[PDB]
Design a protein around this nucleic acid. Structure first.
Lengths: 55, 54, 216
DNA sequence: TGAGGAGTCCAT
């Protein structure tokens, strides 16, 4: 069977799962990157994490 | 498959299929071939007229 | 080894080395064996010895074999491995057996309840990393390219003066040995940081659960 | 005199 985008015709797009300390740190710098020198620009971001906690 | 928001499953059965059919994994050339089946190769060979070649 | 056996609440020790203690050094293996037994007879306990933990035993015999012994029988376990081999496969864990329990595992988390219960390593021995200089086996020219890459890279950052760089390059062109290449890299400052990186990673991978002992 | 080893991808 071949499903279609019409299945998502009515869907909830503005509700997301409750955040964590590790996703705000990802999101906010990127948002500061689109404001100045944005629209079309890359970014190298090294994230120092640790085994254990859910990287 | 098993993500729930506020105690209710986040994705219905039909939505999961659409999302799960959009990801591709690319192995070696020597492991992509042995993963296939006789029917697939026979279908392709007759579909392009390659069986007659020596 | 002697320090580990004479412990009340430890049953798992892993010795990270630089070489594989396989049958090619069989005699040496046997020499340790009857030593352990002797110590194992002094303090009343039965110890398990695991030899030959390479990439050809974790994919042909199974690592789970070790884990089972820690939740189906009593004893201490000593395992011999290397740095590179332990960098692949991950998660050397046994879950639980409260009948076999050493009367205490303190939970460390605050707000969690795990579906199952698992623990990790409680004793490790660290040797000196060796052979910290990249090399290539494909063909004979590729090795030369790699070596010259590293020399020029060290010159740029500021660890090597031009005078030393020319001497090293000249002798490499004429021909040297690996054991004389390793003696000139040890005089720089990158070696220190590389050794520290190895130690930090090897220790960081040694913990993945929330059930811990008291004395490590 | 100088140091001491395993582990890996992919197209031919």
């Amino acid at each position: 069977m071949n499903v279609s985008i019409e299945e998502f015709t009515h869907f909830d797009f503005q509700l997301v799962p409750e955040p964590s300390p590790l996703d705000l740190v990802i999101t906010e710098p990127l948002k500061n990157h689109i404001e100045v020198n944005g629209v079309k620009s890359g970014a190298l971001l090294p994230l120092p994490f640790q085994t254990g906690i859910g990287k | 498959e098993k993500q729930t928001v506020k105690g209710e499953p986040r994705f219905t059965l039909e939505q999961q299929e659409y999302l799960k059919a959009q990801i591709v994994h690319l192995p070696n050339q020597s492991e992509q071939l042995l993963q296939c089946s006789d029917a697939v190769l026979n279908d392709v060979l007759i579909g392009f007229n390659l069986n007659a070649e020596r | 080894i002697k320090a580990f056996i004479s412990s009340p609440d430890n049953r798992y020790m892993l010795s990270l080395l630089n070489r594989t203690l396989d049958t090619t050094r069989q005699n040496i293996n046997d020499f340790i064996q009857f030593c352990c037994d002797k110590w194992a007879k002094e303090f009343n306990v039965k110890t398990k010895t695991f030899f030959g933990v390479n990439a050809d035993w974790m994919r042909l015999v199974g690592y789970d074999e070790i884990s089972k012994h820690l939740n189906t029988e009593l004893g201490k376990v000593v395992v011999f491995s290397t740095y590179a081999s332990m960098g692949a496969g991950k998660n050397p864990d046994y879950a639980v057996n409260l009948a076999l329990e050493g009367e205490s595992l303190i939970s460390v988390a605050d707000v969690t309840y795990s579906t199952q219960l698992r623990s990790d390593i409680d004793s490790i021995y660290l040797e000196k990393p060796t052979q910290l200089l990249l090399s290539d086996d494909y063909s004979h020219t590729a090795n030369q390219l790699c070596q010259f890459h590293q020399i020029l890279s060290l010159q740029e950052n500021g660890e090597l003066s031009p005078k030393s760089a020319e001497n090293w390059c000249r002798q490499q062109l004429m021909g040297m040995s690996r054991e004389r290449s390793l003696q000139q890299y040890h005089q720089t400052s990158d070696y220190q940081s590389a050794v520290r990186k190895y130690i930090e990673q090897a220790v960081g991978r040694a913990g993945r659960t929330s059930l811990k002992r008291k004395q490590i």
